[PDB]
Amino acid sequence: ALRPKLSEEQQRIIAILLDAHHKTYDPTYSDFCQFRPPVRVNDGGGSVTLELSQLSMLPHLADLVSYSIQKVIGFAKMIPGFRDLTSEDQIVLLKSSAIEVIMLRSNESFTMDDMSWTCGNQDYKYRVSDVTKAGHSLELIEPLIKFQVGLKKLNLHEEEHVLLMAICIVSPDRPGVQDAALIEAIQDRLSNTLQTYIRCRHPPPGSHLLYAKMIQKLADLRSLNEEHSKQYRCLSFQPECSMKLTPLVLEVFG
Numbered sequence: 001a002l003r004p005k006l007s008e009e010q011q012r013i014i015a016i017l018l019d020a021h022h023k024t025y026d027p028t029y030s031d032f033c034q035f036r037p038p039v040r041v042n043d044g045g046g047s048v049t050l051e052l053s054q055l056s057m058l059p060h061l062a063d064l065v066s067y068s069i070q071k072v073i074g075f076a077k078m079i080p081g082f083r084d085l086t087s088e089d090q091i092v093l094l095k096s097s098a099i100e101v102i103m104l105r106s107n108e109s110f111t112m113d114d115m116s117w118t119c120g121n122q123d124y125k126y127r128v129s130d131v132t133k134a135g136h137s138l139e140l141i142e143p144l145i146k147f148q149v150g151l152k153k154l155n156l157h158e159e160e161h162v163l164l165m166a167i168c169i170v171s172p173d174r175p176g177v178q179d180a181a182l183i184e185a186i187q188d189r190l191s192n193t194l195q196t197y198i199r200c201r202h203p204p205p206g207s208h209l210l211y212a213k214m215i216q217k218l219a220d221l222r223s224l225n226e227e228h229s230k231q232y233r234c235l236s237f238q239p240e241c242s243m244k245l246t247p248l249v250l251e252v253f254g
Ligand SMILES: C=C1/C(=C\C=C2/CCC[C@]3(C)[C@@H]([C@H](C)OCCC(C)(C)O)CC[C@@H]23)C[C@@H](O)C[C@@H]1O
Pocket: 058, 061, 062, 064, 065, 068, 102, 103, 105, 106, 107, 108, 109, 110, 117, 119, 126, 131, 134, 136, 140, 228, 232, 249
């Protein structure tokens, strides 16, 4: 049960990641009014035909996700070591992790009060029924909500949250990476920072096997990523879908 202190480098890594997150995640959601507006058609019956015909929530949620990818790119660039990677590996890591980091960072707006992502007034409160109105199905949405609740209940320190996002991005087991060894070295530096932080700074009982629980959430995210990809592919078969997306979203998920 040794509890080595955080090294000066580890303290700097945490400070950098906290600063990067504070610069790239606006907790007031003040830009969301600039997105194409949310529209909610009457769909109490959960009609797939209606949902695909209208895709009423897709422009807004696509803009939200596009915006969020831009922010994740900015965050990633500040991760210590990320800029030591080749441009090619950086782009592979960003494209493969984008939806996973979006799912992680969204936990900050997720609330167990009513199981929504609450980002302002009623207009920017996103519920499961809004995600079906963007052309996704419960095979993704239901495990996504379970994931959000499981993550929320870890009661992560912001330090742990930003480390987890950085570890998710800098993953040596993404398809198409060149220098897996360098990526693994960067990830290990982050992982060791997180393990050390938890042992130092996270009091019981919330610290109990917390690192293992966090690593399991990274595995859960792979499953969610795969399902999202399959559903995105099917969504994209809808005529005129591309106009409801953005160029960045089309690249990242196409
Ligand atoms: C983004 C963020 C937010 C919510 C994320 C949500 C709720 C709506 C439904 C989303 C966007 C999920 C669905 C599955 O994403 C669909 C994306 C497309 C339509 C491109 O397939 C994934 C994350 C979900 C809001 C805020 O926390 C910022 C964060 O980056």
